[PDB]
Amino acid sequence: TRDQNGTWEMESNENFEGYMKALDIDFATRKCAVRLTQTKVIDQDGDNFKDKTTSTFRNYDVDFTVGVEFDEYTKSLDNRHVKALVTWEGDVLVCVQKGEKENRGWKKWIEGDKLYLELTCGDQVCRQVFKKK
Amino acid sequence: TRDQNGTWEMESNENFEGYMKALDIDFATRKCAVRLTQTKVIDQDGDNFKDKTTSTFRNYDVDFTVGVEFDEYTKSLDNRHVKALVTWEGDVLVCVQKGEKENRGWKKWIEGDKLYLELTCGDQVCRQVFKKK
């Protein structure tokens, strides 16, 4: 069949490491790209194609309610276990994760068209910045 | 404002390595995710949240026409230059990337419910297998 439209998620990929070697990718990048999942989207018009591949590492879905404390299994990070309590401080969404590490929490808020996420653990502060899309 | 719905693409992310270090993520995993771009999708209903994150290492768009030759800048792989010519051999979509390396091309073909990808550079063959969705 020549009809290749649709979304195809990779399920097996072999000798990717070698194909990347003969292309002269550095070793650091190689031992990463083999951890990403790939997803192909092909749009076909007889013989006119528009296909976009995407290598996606891991992803977390957390669905909760503010004021409630709930169970967060930080799979895709360190699979640690915390008690997460979320509260508002003005317009800023603040969570603290009561558990193994101290100062494990985050802050998220909207300022114009960029969403600000601060991630803090220990004496480390991570600053994440997102523009809408 | 407390309204955080929408799709957020990260544009700057700093001290991610430090935040992850204090989480004791291993050095190999750390030196990876600092390459990932991150995309957040927030679903809000008053005080009830549904957040889904993603992390994207690299992404490629190649849009062409069979029989026609075009220039492919292999971003997301080695950011090299090839002239790519795509042709059918039956139900097998065949490309050759004439450029620096020998045998640089690929084969794509469908067998029912799965898409098969064969990737070759030089003497190395990568075989990828995808299921529809």
Nearest C-alpha in A relative to B122: A22
Residues 15-44 of A with CB under 8 A from B: 15-16, 18-25, 28, 31-33, 35-36, 38, 40
Decide: helix, strand or coil at residue A16: helix
User: Any alpha helices (H) in A4-56, and if so which ranges?
Assistant: 16-22, 27-33
Nearest to A55 among B2, B56, B80 (CB): B56
Structure determined via:
X-ray
Q: Is the dihedral of CA B62, B64, B67, B68 positive or negative?
A: negative
Instruction: Round to whole Å and give the CA distance between A124 and B51.
Output: 24
Q: Where are the domains of chain B?
A: 1-133
Name residues whose C-beta falls within 8 Å of residue A56's C-beta, 6 or more positions apart in sequence. Answer: A36, A37, A38, A39, B54, B55, B56, B57
- The region that residue A78 occupies, defined by phi over 0 for left and psi between -120 and 50 for alpha, beta otherwise, is alpha
Chain position carrying tokens 């091309």? B105
